[PDB]
Design a protein around this ligand. Structure first.
Ligand SMILES: Nc1ncnc2c1ncn2[C@@H]1O[C@H](COP(=O)(O)OP(=O)(O)O)[C@@H](O)[C@H]1O
Ligand SMILES: [Cl-]
Length: 425
């Protein structure tokens, strides 16, 4: 099996990350990378704690961890989070001053974030860091982008195959969002991984109740059920994210909420570092109750006690949907995730697909639209449908205790209300 962490390892976790213990799969990955120096492909679900797997090992041994990712604003967010935890880190690119390069060469930075493009164009730097400081691990986030069948293919990822040539002694952790075998096979081949440890957290978030409801024709009438009149004003029942498919719909939703004097903020791709910091401050401290968002990552919506998620409009696809609802209930307490949709929603509109150029991509949008619509229309357990997608296999109901109970999803709750059976075994 896997040996337990030692005292020094647990002390370092507490000192720098604020956690009393590792989660099981975090430990499997960290032990494998840190103590067995083994390549890893790790599938980690929402809010499990994926970042610890590449941030912890270089902090523990005092060397460099290289993190490769296309998501620049997210890397900036992570650098700030690390700095606030007394861990030095930086985002290294072309614009960087000469002096930051010398600081990295002297080992100032425990975690170095780079884009795929920067990484591919500076292998000599990495070899110098490897020889002078030592690289504990290379983390490739979004590693599915190196696959054509990963549907987010990035040509910038193709040249990551040189990593194992240039740095044969350095273990690579590849992080991906589903347990798909065809994606895993492409990651292993394109990253030249050697006998990697494969791990999967599984995907369930049992404290997230799932519900789907049709739009009624007016924004306030749609959102009213989620509101409570505390004497003198309206409020959401608790902290809420409303996901919208476009900035235009975001502005529509925001205008209606301001008719009720509800405190809210918006959250979009492209917001400055200072803007994302300010939203993070206001949301965490509950100075705004609701964030209306067109993106599902970044510090702005990083809050432990989000009680309600509302998709205002059909979600884009199962993967975006899962990541979006996963921002809810990070504290483990009960939360709800509601989709409000109509057949006319833009994410269900096949007539918008006629003008996209790539046939293989358009067939994917078609299949994903079809899958999302089938989910939204279903009378069956919502949680089973989602879990089956991410496991890449039919998940059977009652492989999990939440499934089939009143808190599982609207369709399970309805079947129980209509004299259904409660699966004592
Ligand atoms: N070992 C741990 N014990 C408790 N909480 C943890 C642990 N590791 C990570 N977390 C928490 O998990 C949450 C999600 O971490 P994050 O890096 O956002 O995960 P992801 O990016 O996988 O959603 C954060 O609240 C983080 O503090
Ligand atoms: Cl829509």
């Amino acid at each position: 099996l896997w040996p337990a962490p030692n005292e020094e390892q647990v002390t370092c976790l507490k000192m720098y990350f604020g956690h009393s213990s590792f989660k099981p799969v975090q430990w499997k990955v960290i032990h494998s990378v840190l103590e067995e120096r083994r390549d890893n492909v790790a599938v980690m679900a929402t809010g499990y704690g994926k970042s610890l797997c590449f941030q912890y090992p270089p902090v523990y041994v005092g060397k460099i961890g290289l993190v490769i990712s296309p998501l620049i604003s997210l890397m900036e967010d992570q650098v700030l989070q690390l700095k606030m935890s007394n861990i030095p880190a930086c985002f290294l690119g072309s614009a960087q001053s000469e002096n930051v390069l010398t600081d990295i060469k002297l080992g100032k930075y425990r975690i170095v974030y780079v884009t795929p493009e920067y990484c591919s164009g500076n292998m000599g730097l990495l070899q110098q860091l490897e020889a002078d400081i030592g690289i504990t691990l290379i983390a490739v986030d979004e590693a599915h982008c190196i696959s054509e069948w990963g549907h987010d293919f990035r040509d910038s990822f193709r040249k990551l195959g040189s990593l194992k040539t240039a740095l044969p002694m350095v273990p690579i952790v590849a992080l991906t969002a589903t347990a798909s075998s065809s994606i895993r096979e492409d990651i292993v081949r394109c990253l030249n991984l050697r006998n990697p440890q494969i791990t999967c957290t599984g995907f369930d978030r049992p404290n997230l109740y799932l519900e789907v409801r049709r739009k009624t024709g007016n924004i306030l009438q749609d959102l009213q059920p989620f509101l409570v009149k505390t004497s003198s004003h309206w409020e959401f029942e608790g902290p809420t994210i409303i996901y919208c498919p476009s900035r235009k719909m975001t502005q529509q939703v925001t205008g209606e909420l301001r008719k009720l004097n509800l405190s809210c903020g918006t959250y979009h791709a492209g917001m400055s570092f200072s803007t994302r910091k300010d939203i993070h401050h206001r949301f965490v401290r509950d100075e705004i109750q609701c964030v209306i968002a067109t993106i599902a990552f970044g510090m702005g919506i990083n809050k432990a006690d989000i009680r309600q998620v509302i998709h205002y409009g059909a979600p884009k696809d199962m993967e975006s949907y899962y990541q979006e609802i996963g921002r809810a209930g990070r504290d483990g307490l009960q939360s709800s995730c509601h989709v409000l949709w109509a057949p006319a929603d833009i994410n269900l509109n096949r007539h918008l697909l006629t003008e996209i150029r790539n046939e293989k991509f358009r067939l994917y949008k078609l299949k994903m639209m079809a899958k999302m619509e089938k989910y939204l229309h279903s009378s069956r357990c919502r949680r089973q449908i989602i879990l089956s997608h991410f496991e890449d296999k039919q998940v059977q109901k009652a492989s999990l205790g939440i499934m089939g109970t009143e808190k599982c999803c609207d369709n399970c709750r309805s079947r129980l209300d209509h004299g259904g059976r409660l699966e004592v075994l």
